[PDB]
Amino acid sequence: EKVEMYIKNLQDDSPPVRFNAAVALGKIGDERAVEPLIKALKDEDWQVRKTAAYALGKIGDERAVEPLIKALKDEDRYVRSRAALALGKIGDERAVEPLIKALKDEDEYVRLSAASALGKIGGERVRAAMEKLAETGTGFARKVAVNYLETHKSLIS
Amino acid sequence: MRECISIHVGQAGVQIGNACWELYCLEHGIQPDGQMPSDKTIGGGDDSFNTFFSETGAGKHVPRAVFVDLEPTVIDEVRTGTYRQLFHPEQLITGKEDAANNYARGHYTIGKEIIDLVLDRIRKLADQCTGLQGFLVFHSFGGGTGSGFTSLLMERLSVDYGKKSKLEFSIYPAPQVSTAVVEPYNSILTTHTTLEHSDCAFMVDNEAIYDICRRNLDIERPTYTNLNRLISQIVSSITASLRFDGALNVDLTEFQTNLVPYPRIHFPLATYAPVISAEKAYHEQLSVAEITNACFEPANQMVKCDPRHGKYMACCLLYRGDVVPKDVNAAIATIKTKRSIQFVDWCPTGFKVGINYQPPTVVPGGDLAKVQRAVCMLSNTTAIAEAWARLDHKFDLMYAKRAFVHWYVGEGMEEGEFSEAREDMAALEKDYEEVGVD
Amino acid sequence: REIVHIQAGQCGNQIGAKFWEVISDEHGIDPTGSYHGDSDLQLERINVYYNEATGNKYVPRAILVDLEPGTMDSVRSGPFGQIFRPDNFVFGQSGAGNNWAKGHYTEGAELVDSVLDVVRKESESCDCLQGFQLTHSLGGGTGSGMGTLLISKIREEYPDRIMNTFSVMPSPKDTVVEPYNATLSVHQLVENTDETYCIDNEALYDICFRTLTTPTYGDLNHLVSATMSGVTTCLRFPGQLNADLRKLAVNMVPFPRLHFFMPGFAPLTSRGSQRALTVPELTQQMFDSKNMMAACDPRHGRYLTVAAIFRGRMSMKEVDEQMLNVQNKNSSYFVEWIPNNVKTAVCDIPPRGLKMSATFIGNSTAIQELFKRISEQFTAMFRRKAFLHWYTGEGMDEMEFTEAESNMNDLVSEYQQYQDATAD
Amino acid sequence: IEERPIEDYLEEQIQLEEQELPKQPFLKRGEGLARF
Ligand SMILES: Nc1nc2c(ncn2[C@@H]2O[C@H](COP(=O)(O)OP(=O)(O)OP(=O)(O)O)[C@@H](O)[C@H]2O)c(=O)[nH]1
Ligand SMILES: Nc1nc2c(ncn2[C@@H]2O[C@H](COP(=O)(O)OP(=O)(O)O)[C@@H](O)[C@H]2O)c(=O)[nH]1
């Protein structure tokens, strides 16, 4: 298993080696790379960070939920939007309120990523949060809540 | 999200656009059918390629490309070739009779019969875009369709898509592969009428590509196949930023913001390194320091000129591969000191930098070697006026005796259109002279 | 896409037959009409001169016209006689008697109505008709007189379509009125054709006794057929340079009146001979007056535009080095105000028998020496108004002869104008 | 048919013609320029 070699490369001095180790850790979706890729989410380099966010969506470990919610506050637009799509893939209801706030981001790709992650999570937390947003909210968040409610009706009305 | 539609007009336009789409697929993990299987894809999560490829319900990714030619033999190879199932038949448009190397036939006489179907096929593509950025237009300067039809299409895109950017890839003529004596005429005519329609135009001098092929690739007598292979490798370096996650030139808007301070002077020069022969004996992979230095050798440019007799308005470096930012900062310091590069008076002096860590891609089996790290420098130097002057001087020589003018006049163009275009060129030469003064 | 060929007069039909025998061998089409070739390169652009018939049969897009029956009976007999469409043989039983005025207004106007019908029939089959190609002599009656009539009728019905001619220029080296028909024909050629390949009979005779004892018609025709196959290689085979009649004229004709080309061919072969010519050897001969199909010397005139075609297997780099050297060592005979005027094309397929060749097509101002000879010969018979009663009685105008002679003298005056033109 | 065989005579033939011995519109010079 080259997993251990790629985990050590995640902490390499060379940023493209750290990047290519995150890309490879995502393809070899192993549980041995969850804590290592969670640390690469605190990388100085945005490109390593955004790749670690995708690799953590692929593994789908519940351990990545809380650090991917912190990554939703990241300075970089790719880290916010890839962290959103990773949380959509994990499907943990712990990400419902931070994904609703990400609907107000200045970045278009981050808003669309969060809207689509909420629809991929589903359940009763998202049902209740959209019912509230389609009555008390406005703008993109409002159209997302309305669209969520329309695509989730069991009847024609 | 933010899409780009590519338009390929004429033989050169269609042949280079086909070589570009082939490399895009290889870069993104797309098969000639349009599928992106798990094995073929880069497992990084980067979906920025969706700006160039639409997606069907069956998971087929389709280039947002339109191919136009007044004669069918070039586009018939696209319809039949490897990528016959990559594009929808609706995107491949052919006339029956070509512009016979006459700008007037492509713009007036023949071009007018096909312009509304071309705009309809472009509108069909545009309708699938939630946030279309604009267009990338590939065409020659010397052919009648690439010159004439392009300027007609450019004029119309401005009206139908007012707020949208238009980037060109223009094939600048060369005597080693010249098919017409009237090429300086078409080149000056398409420049004048397209000038206010394009936001940024990348000229590809066929002579510069010929020299790089002979010298770095060891190809004795280069053909279009050889030229288009290096042209596509370079043009794909310039467009990469649009198809991948990055921090520089991420949208068509950013090309003028970073490269074009003065709108008429919108012709950046591109310098690509390293160009290595697949047949070369073992060499150590060239460093960031080495490839950054090659960017300032006029032999590596895709336009024949000398920036050392000229000033800069803008300078961008787009790195690809095993490129360490600390090594790029160190190499740029060496250029900013030990190199004597001169900026124009009211433009900042900084060099903008972009680094995409994914390894460089080449087409398997071609003339080029797979390198560990590459760079494309985009620079707006005043030196590029040398290429304008060469075309202008050849135009002046023939127009002094009204040689071949009758062909254009008898095809819907007025005689005064020749002198009006040459006036615009004389003004553009002066613009380059005015920004370079101390 | 498609070239409609027309062969007017005895010479037009004789050279027309030798043209079809040479291009039919090159394309693999046997005398019956079936494809007996071996490579798909022969059929890629077969539609330019041939129509696909029932089965694998291919019929030439050719119309055969002559006011005498003799040439229609001789075309039918011999090789590839049974390849032409039977209904495309328009032959009158009266004759021309070697007069331009008889062929343009009297016996020509009677038959031209039925010829234009056959022209329409073949042009209606066309998907995208490229233009027309006429083979004819300029000293006779049917070829010179009815030929210039067919050009003007077609120029009115198909105004956009490119008109091209293979015009045989008469030489005394036996008909009294040979320069009268030639001077009247050239007048029409200046106004109605887009490309005129001057095939001088004086040059064919000089290149048969000085270079190659008593030359025959078929000996001059052998040089003609080897020329016609070379100048049409770019149209019959897949190529980048001058692939059609319009793209050729847009590179070869800078001034509308000046569309009179000088053909050249190397190496010079006789009718039935037993060396393999190299690229540098081919290049010098390509630009030598001893290898010209028109009796002119290009060292006395400047080339406005040139087109060179190399056939057979050779180094493209060696052709580049030789074509640059022929233009650098002789830049004194090239026009400075027409940059990159010389265009070179290389076809992998060689001509019949030979392994390597070079066909030259030059629009040089030195051709005013051919038109000077015709003016010196026409004004010799016009000095005393000799035999004008043979053309006056046919219905021609007095000022018609004065306009044909003045328009040709203007062409020579224009050739010297662009010869003495400094770019500076 | 490939076996078909090949100044002062003109001066003598001109004197021989001297012993024995519906205006149709023709082409105008410059009319070829009308197509451009
Ligand atoms: N690099 C490169 N140059 C080409 C190619 N094809 C043609 N050219 C160049 O483009 C010019 C001729 O223009 P073309 O693109 O062939 O013409 P077109 O737009 O089809 O115009 P028409 O054929 O006259 O209707 C010349 O300068 C050629 O050298 C090609 O595949 N690659
Ligand atoms: N090259 C060539 N020239 C010919 C041939 N027959 C006649 N000529 C020339 O054609 C001219 C006479 O025209 P011709 O075709 O015989 O008369 P037409 O039938 O009335 O047009 C003279 O200049 C002849 O030298 C031939 O077979 N080959």
Ligand SMILES: [Mg+2]
């Ligand atoms: Mg073309």
